Ligand binder design. Structure first.
Ligand SMILES: CN1CCN(c2ccc(-c3cnc4[nH]c5cnc(C#N)cc5c4c3)cc2)CC1
Length: 264
């Protein structure tokens, strides 16, 4: 199959700080891929981390190539687009769908954590869907190593996206990586079941966050959410990261294990 790497750019799939992501269609194979085209006039690290990842719930990395100041990253294309666009404003989505997506999210995150990588910016805009609605974690531009040679490193850089960030990132100088990812997964689950985000940020200066800590679940978004998934959100959206539920224990939750969706 000669000329297997020859692509034509057809559409702006997204747009970041450095550059954009484009859909690129192949020559002889006719393959489709996504290309992150960053204009340097960070990505070095983003490539290194990308080179480590091999999981069915992580957007696959193919390769890279620079031409002067413009670094190209060739990555798996996700024709289902962002999870963000499967969430109906003020409604969310059907609970069986949210559950499946959450199962796949946990699988992707467990994998990353297992190899000592934290994503640090999990949100529906970064969670993409393949042709069969399978969820793929993307955009490792903020990601970093939290474990190496079996030895955990505490994080201190504030980053991510405020509605999704865990409160210790706003309150403590140092914090453990994995609980921060767990928290953002909870915010994602809330958005899926409610079609709204619970607060601007989890600080005591935010009334919606204060309401949540006071357990006023008779307010939105919580009142839209069934008791079972809500009980899980109570365990995830815990202000103390050391008390917060861990992924092994999320996997044992009653809602997490509730039979909801028929197979294809
Ligand atoms: C009008 N809508 C705009 C948003 N749309 C849309 C959004 C995102 C994608 C899309 C598909 N595959 C993708 N593979 C990727 C790999 N890495 C990144 C990054 N960073 C981003 C992607 C990526 C984005 C494709 C479509 C759906 C259509």
């Amino acid at each position: 199959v000669p000329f297997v790497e020859d692509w034509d750019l057809v559409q702006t799939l997204g747009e970041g700080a450095y550059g954009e992501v484009q859909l690129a269609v192949n020559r002889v194979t006719e393959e489709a891929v996504a290309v992150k085209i960053v204009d340097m006039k960070n990505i070095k690290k983003e490539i290194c981390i990308n080179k480590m990842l091999n999981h069915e719930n992580v957007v696959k990395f193919y390769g890279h190539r620079r031409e002067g100041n413009i670094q190209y990253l060739f990555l798996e294309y996700c024709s289902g687009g962002e999870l963000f666009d499967r969430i109906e404003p003020d409604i969310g989505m059907p609970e069986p769908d949210a559950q499946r997506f959450f199962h796949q999210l946990m699988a992707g995150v467990v994998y990353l954590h297992g190899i000592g990588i934290t994503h640090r910016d999990i949100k529906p805009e970064n969670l993409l869907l393949d042709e069969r609605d399978n969820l793929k974690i993307s955009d490792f531009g903020l990601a970093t190593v939290f474990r190496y040679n079996n030895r955990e490193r505490l994080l201190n850089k504030m980053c991510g996206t405020l509605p999704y960030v865990a409160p210790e990132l706003l309150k403590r100088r140092e914090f453990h990586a994995e609980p921060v990812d767990v928290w953002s997964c909870g915010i994602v689950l809330t958005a899926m079941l409610a079609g709204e985000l619970p607060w601007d940020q989890p600080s005591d200066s935010c009334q919606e966050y204060s309401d949540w800590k006071e357990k006023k679940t008779y307010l939105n978004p919580w009142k839209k959410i069934d008791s079972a998934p809500l009980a899980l959100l109570h365990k995830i959206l815990v202000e103390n990261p050391s008390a917060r539920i861990t992924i092994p224990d999320i996997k044992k939750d009653r809602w997490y294990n509730k039979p909801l969706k028929k197979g294809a």
